[model samples]
Target: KSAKDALLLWCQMKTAGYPNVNIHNFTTSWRDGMAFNALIHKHRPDLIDFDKLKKSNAHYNLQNAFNLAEQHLGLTKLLDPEDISVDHPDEKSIITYVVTYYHYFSKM
Candidate 1:
């Protein structure tokens, strides 16, 4: 499956309800991403190439600065300098690095 698809599945598995560990409150963006990748990999070690996913998913690079925003209703992560393709951290996007993940959470 595609990176998006894999993450979607990972989301379901986490918030599937009535089963599995339900982690609340966000952040630790890199941590969450790594955990998701780990779970996805555990189920299907050959499913998603994390190396490629990280490269393709630019937000994954901000240290993925995940934090609160929009009155606590979205995945607005901090933007690292590398995230903006610059050499300074002064410019932070303060938004969802990837719209795909944001939308998925909204739907759920």
Candidate 2:
């Protein structure tokens, strides 16, 4: 039983499939968890020591990322996680503009 559980945990972390409940803000998935860990480890180890503002939290969503963005990315307090969804394209103009690619070839 223990062996199987360990294997499952290992796989979840490897694939970022871990599930975190939203008992609190800053939920995070396994993928986001590792991403935040690595980024903090490289740029702000101190924050890691104290678990300061960063991405990936116990909730497994991106609560930490949003919090950090509020401070660093200038992300507004009004934009919550659900607000940053692909579903709400109407309000994603900023994101779209940021991710937009070069224009197509000019017409003849």
Candidate 3:
């Protein structure tokens, strides 16, 4: 599998069973931020109350996920909420960010 395929599968597996989360790629699939929350919640459930998040507020969701990942998980904030809550977020950028989560969560 390609790196994208591997990471996409990893994300798909990690976020499985989460409500409103269905990760299919490294772009629009993540625009709502639910997938990001689900990924983090899968590893650290306490950091995010998944049920409280709303798909309508993509900026809030993305900001919350990115900020929490930075402060609590020690993940670098490589992409801003604005960067992802767009029509077409950069695939390479999203992959770079998700790789951080993959590397960190995979160890635990």
Candidate 4:
């Protein structure tokens, strides 16, 4: 029985081909749970008091988002997240772009 049974996490124990020998699972997968924990431990260690590998995964995520936005809007210049956050500007363009990408790569 794992402590985490509501984080939508799961962990499976496997050895060779013994499918029924021994098996285990968590509320969520350890891989993703570890990643989330590491993110907090590494970035906000002062607040969480944790030791973890410091990393900035948002860079690549944002970059991919920009590229996807470009592909969605068929643009040449890079798209900045800040600009998208603005509301004084028209939201239709960004909304359209987001929906396009959300549906476009969701399958892959």
Highest TM-score against the true fold, candidate = 3
lDDT of 1 at 18: 21
What are the per-residue Cα lDDT tens digits for candidate 1 across 39-77?
Answer: 333333464444444433434633332322221335444
Question: Whose lDDT is greatest here?
Answer: 3
lDDT of 2 by residue, 1-108 (tens): 464345334333432421231111122222233333333233344443433433334333335544653465453444344444333223233222212210110111
lDDT of 3 by residue, 47-104 (tens): 9999999898899999999999999999999988888999999988989999999999
RMSD of each: 12.3, 13.3, 1.0, 15.3
Pairs clashing in candidate 1?
65-78
Tens digit per residue, CA lDDT, model 4, 1-108 = 233332112112112232221222321111122322332223234433223322233333334435533554353333354443333423344334333433443334
Q: Which scores better on lDDT, 1 or 4?
A: 1
Candidates sorted on lDDT, descending: 3, 1, 2, 4
lDDT of 2 at 88: 27
Backbone clash count, each prediction separately: 1, 10, 0, 7
TM-score for each predicted model, relative to the true structure:
0.24, 0.28, 0.95, 0.26
Badly placed stretches (over 4 Å) of model 4 are 1-64, 68-79, 87-89, 106-108
Model 1 stretches with alpha carbons more than 4 Å out: 1-12, 15-22, 29-33, 42-44, 48-108
TM-score, structure 2 vs. true: 0.28
Model 4 whole-model lDDT (C-alpha atoms): 0.31
